[PDB]
Design an enzyme around this catalytic site. Sequence first.
Site, PDB file in Angstrom:
ATOM      1  N   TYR A 107     -47.088  22.186  63.803  1.00 38.31           N
ATOM      2  CA  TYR A 107     -47.173  23.169  64.884  1.00 38.31           C
ATOM      3  C   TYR A 107     -48.636  23.433  65.295  1.00 38.31           C
ATOM      4  CZ  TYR A 107     -47.154  28.026  66.737  1.00 38.31           C
ATOM      5  OH  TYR A 107     -47.333  29.204  67.434  1.00 38.31           O
ATOM      6  N   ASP A 125     -42.469  26.850  55.282  1.00 40.34           N
ATOM      7  CA  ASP A 125     -42.206  27.604  56.495  1.00 40.34           C
ATOM      8  C   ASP A 125     -40.792  27.210  56.955  1.00 40.34           C
ATOM      9  OD1 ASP A 125     -42.030  28.313  59.317  1.00 40.34           O
ATOM     10  OD2 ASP A 125     -44.186  28.668  59.205  1.00 40.34           O
ATOM     11  N   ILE A 156     -38.768  28.853  59.106  1.00 42.40           N
ATOM     12  CA  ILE A 156     -38.382  29.607  60.297  1.00 42.40           C
ATOM     13  C   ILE A 156     -37.239  28.964  61.100  1.00 42.40           C
ATOM     14  CG2 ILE A 156     -39.990  28.553  61.950  1.00 42.40           C
ATOM     15  CD1 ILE A 156     -40.400  31.131  63.308  1.00 42.40           C
ATOM     16  N   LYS A 175     -36.730  32.438  65.753  1.00 43.66           N
ATOM     17  CA  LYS A 175     -36.072  31.216  66.225  1.00 43.66           C
ATOM     18  C   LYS A 175     -34.551  31.079  66.100  1.00 43.66           C
ATOM     19  CE  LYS A 175     -39.379  30.403  68.159  1.00 43.66           C
ATOM     20  NZ  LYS A 175     -40.784  29.981  67.990  1.00 43.66           N
TER      21      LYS A 175
HETATM   22  C1  LIG Z   1     -41.514  30.086  69.273  1.00 42.72           C
HETATM   23  C2  LIG Z   1     -42.863  29.360  69.176  1.00 42.72           C
HETATM   24  C3  LIG Z   1     -42.616  28.040  68.406  1.00 42.72           C
HETATM   25  N1  LIG Z   1     -42.995  28.164  66.979  1.00 42.72           N
HETATM   26  C4  LIG Z   1     -43.694  29.177  66.442  1.00 42.72           C
HETATM   27  C5  LIG Z   1     -43.960  29.156  65.047  1.00 42.72           C
HETATM   28  C6  LIG Z   1     -44.421  30.400  64.299  1.00 42.72           C
HETATM   29  C7  LIG Z   1     -44.607  31.744  65.053  1.00 42.72           C
HETATM   30  O1  LIG Z   1     -43.360  32.496  65.050  1.00 42.72           O
HETATM   31  P1  LIG Z   1     -43.293  34.159  65.119  1.00 42.72           P
HETATM   32  O2  LIG Z   1     -42.386  34.537  63.997  1.00 42.72           O
HETATM   33  O3  LIG Z   1     -42.684  34.546  66.375  1.00 42.72           O
HETATM   34  O4  LIG Z   1     -44.681  34.739  65.004  1.00 42.72           O
HETATM   35  C8  LIG Z   1     -44.665  30.317  62.933  1.00 42.72           C
HETATM   36  N2  LIG Z   1     -44.480  29.092  62.282  1.00 42.72           N
HETATM   37  C9  LIG Z   1     -44.056  27.872  62.856  1.00 42.72           C
HETATM   38  C10 LIG Z   1     -43.943  26.705  61.902  1.00 42.72           C
HETATM   39  C11 LIG Z   1     -43.784  27.870  64.263  1.00 42.72           C
HETATM   40  O5  LIG Z   1     -43.389  26.756  64.817  1.00 42.72           O
HETATM   41  C12 LIG Z   1     -43.369  26.870  69.068  1.00 42.72           C
HETATM   42  O6  LIG Z   1     -43.663  26.853  70.331  1.00 42.72           O
HETATM   43  O7  LIG Z   1     -43.667  25.904  68.357  1.00 42.72           O
END
Ligand SMILES: *CC[C@H](NCc1c(COP(=O)(O)O)cnc(C)c1O)C(=O)O
EC number: 1.4.-.-
Lengths: 417, 417
Positions: free
Chosen positions: A135, A220, A222, A257
């Site tokens: 990412y 991670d 998510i 997500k």
């Molecule tokens: C939705 C954006 C997506 N990925 C973000 C992201 C985050 C941030 O998420 P949040 O909980 O809203 O702060 C954290 N970790 C990872 C691994 C990812 O991908 C994107 O556009 O990639």
Amino acid sequence: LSRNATSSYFLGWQEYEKNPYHEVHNTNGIIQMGLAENQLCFDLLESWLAKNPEAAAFKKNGESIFAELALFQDYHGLPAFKKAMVDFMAEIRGNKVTFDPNHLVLTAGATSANETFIFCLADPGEAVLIPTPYYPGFDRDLKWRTGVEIVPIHCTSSNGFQITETALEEAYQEAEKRNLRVKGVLVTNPSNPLGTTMTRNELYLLLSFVEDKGIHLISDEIYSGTAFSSPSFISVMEVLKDSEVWQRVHVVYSLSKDLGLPGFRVGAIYSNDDMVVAAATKMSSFGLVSSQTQHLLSAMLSDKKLTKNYIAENHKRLKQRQKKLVSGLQKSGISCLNGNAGLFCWVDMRHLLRSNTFEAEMELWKKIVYEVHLNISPGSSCHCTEPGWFRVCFANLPERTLDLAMQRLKAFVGEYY
Amino acid sequence: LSRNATSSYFLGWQEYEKNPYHEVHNTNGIIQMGLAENQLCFDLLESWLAKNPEAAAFKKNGESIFAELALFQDYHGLPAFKKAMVDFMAEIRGNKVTFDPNHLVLTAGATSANETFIFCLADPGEAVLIPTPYYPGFDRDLKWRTGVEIVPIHCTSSNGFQITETALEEAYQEAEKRNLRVKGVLVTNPSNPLGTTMTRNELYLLLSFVEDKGIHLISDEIYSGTAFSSPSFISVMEVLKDSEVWQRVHVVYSLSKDLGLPGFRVGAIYSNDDMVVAAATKMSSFGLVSSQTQHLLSAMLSDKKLTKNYIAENHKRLKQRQKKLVSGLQKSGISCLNGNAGLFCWVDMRHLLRSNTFEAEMELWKKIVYEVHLNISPGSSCHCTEPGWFRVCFANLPERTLDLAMQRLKAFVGEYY
Ligand SMILES: *CC[C@H](NCc1c(COP(=O)(O)O)cnc(C)c1O)C(=O)O
Ligand SMILES: *CC[C@H](NCc1c(COP(=O)(O)O)cnc(C)c1O)C(=O)O
Ligand SMILES: [K+]
Ligand code: NI
Ligand code: NI
Ligand code: NI
Ligand code: NI
């Protein structure tokens, strides 16, 4: 100002806002396929809310608890919400694993939880190993204020971008070379931008490597709830369920997500290390979750009927939406990595590169954004080792708009190839 | 772990939870007068909410906007909320000053906004000047992760703990002595723990000093809406309204204290420096405000009838509550600094000290907490230069409980003096 106060993934995103697409006011606008958001299952939530107004009414068991919530700023988090969270995470993992709420730490999104974890394990100048591609936001989240360095564990399309013993030792040899003290490995499972679940062999490989190096493992997870196809999602915590290495295995989660609520900023850290928790706990003070949101999601995530139906319906719609992008791409003769998760496809556009260079990748990217009017993330932005790959998000827009993007793409290719 | 991962204000707080007072389940419990919270005006909000259910219903102009909010994670903040915020801040300042919403940056509470500001102006090893006594939480908020140092600007009861030209030069001479690069001064107006508004002369003095040193001025105005008595609250921004120094004047705000919503985590930074904003803006990603909370407070802070009545009713109840503590104290022969703001009184208990030392202060504190069962903040915890002073919060509990505390206090003094 100060040092701290003073790419394409972020540029294309800014260009999108300078001229966003609109099915009525701006049809020649830029279509956003660069943000991994899930707008597919809002109807299920919107519906539930309109019929269960008490949560949003600051009321519990009928009685108002507005004053209690307004005052709740405990960095330990609302207990009813933490329990609802650990059960939801257990449910996503087929209840094959269980989480202790006193070991769960809430943060304002996973952005806040990843940085926090870095601050707890790595001192400035130290380092963390991260599999590429990864990412793009990691460059900012993990380095900007922590001063910590990321050493890439390279992965190629040869073996489907999986993690190999070779890549691990190699990345670690690069650290030792730069006299960087490696504190741990941070992995994304399911992977962003690959959109693939990690295999059990990859998981065992990671657990073994960090056991031989005496370092930490951060997973991670998510996208754990976006595993819409076989094989099954395997949490690193499940692999530990089949001496002292478990005290160095950690999980980062978020409701951004799977639930599609990035705006509510609900993130979390889970560790087995009593020390990490207490320290992460104290640091959450810098980014706590609104008690209002905690209470709302506490009611929603407590309705086992709502969550069971949401998860099943989300997988179904995700899968259907994923095939529609794959087929749309196959239509222009473009292939994708065989993915079974995430909100995007890792697309192979190497055969459209003027040359096997990143310069050529850049050029192809510029044209797509400025000519096709599509925003997608180039692979260099993800630190991919080989040019030509792009991440394309499929769940952040209307189906009809998705078709439109595909048409503009088919025209383009059949317009220059 | 790491370096970052590895007082009385925090201990007394933890003791309170180990044995909290309860008017039914635990009458011999510890009474909490150590947390500056305002529970006086909840009824006005609770009432408004039960009759204006649309905000909490994710609905605008009648139509559902749940999907839009669920997706809103823009680090620029919801525009309707920022406008509602800048007008509320203008209203608190008698509309004598105006704020531009494109210059306002939202953060998860003022804890998050103060640290963020430190990260933007001071590199590790650098320094900031802060008038003592000051909020105990500053030691954690501003130093733990920024690596920046705080150099105290000492203030004594001689001139009512006001800031003097002498103290400023002296504090700055101490910095130069320790070869610390001073980046700015951070002040609290109204002052915590003094509970006093800053005089115009003190403000001009600060503006002049930072103009001669070429450094920044940060004013933590979180208690701006708790100025329940004359003289009037004077924002640093108003003083600038009567060359290039204004680009180095900044404001930190929060809805935690005037509205009494610390649980919702709404903080903000306001600067005139386009550069600071853009950088602070990017950093907010680590602690954004839940879009749900933003939308709710956007509706509430938009009802000019609700805010006008809330402010007036809050000042009134605060003043009445303040006199009840002063009189209760006078009853045991204890005097307070003449305060006209805040949610607490800075109490003079020097005449109860065994000796003019902090050791004696500690001893008096221990007895109060372990014998009188009252939690209050000792002055050493605030880095006060002279022993004997304590901060006592009066707005975080029921009036009857406040009387109880006073009785236990009168008995104690008339039991050892
Ligand atoms: C939705 C954006 C997506 N990925 C973000 C992201 C985050 C941030 O998420 P949040 O909980 O809203 O702060 C954290 N970790 C990872 C691994 C990812 O991908 C994107 O556009 O990639
Ligand atoms: C309510 C605690 C009170 N003061 C806290 C405080 C903060 C943190 O506020 P938040 O917006 O909720 O993160 C920031 N700045 C100052 C100057 C103070 O006092 C207390 O107990 O003192
Ligand atoms: K938040
Ligand atoms: Ni707690
Ligand atoms: Ni434990
Ligand atoms: Ni924006
Ligand atoms: Ni401007």
